[PDB]
Amino acid sequence: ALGKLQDVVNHNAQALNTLVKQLSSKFGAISSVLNDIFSRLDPPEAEVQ
Amino acid sequence: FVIRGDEVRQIAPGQTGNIADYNYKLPDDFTGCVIAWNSNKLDSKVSGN
């Protein structure tokens, strides 16, 4: 019957899970890894990426 | 300075190339204009320059 505490814990856990997963989003960029953009792309538009 | 027409594009902020890397490298955050014109008439003797 401990629905409320379990719900609060699950909500916090899923918020953290969404936050940790959101960084895999490409956001329309060439790559999702910073050093790849900094090394294999020219600064003039790697900066805007 | 004087360079060939093959590397006229190498003079740019953060662009790869032998001339850019070893002779003159532009900063990544650069504000300014680049002016390039042919110099075959002025700087090409019949024997060679």
Structure tokens at A43: 């600064």
Among B28, B30, B31, most A C-beta atoms within 10 A, so best to mutate, is B28
CB B42 within 8 A of CB B9: no
DSSP symbol at B26: B
CA–CA gap between residue B39 and residue B45 (Å, rounded): 11
CB B10 within 8 A of CB B17: yes
Match 């594009």 to its residue by tokens. Answer: B9
Residues in chain B with CB shorter than 8 Å from the CB of A44 are 12-14, 28
Structure tokens at B30: 């650069």
Resolution of the entry in angstroms: 2.8
Longest Cα–Cα distance of chain A, Å, equals: 59
Residues in chain A with CB shorter than 8 Å from the CB of B29 are 43
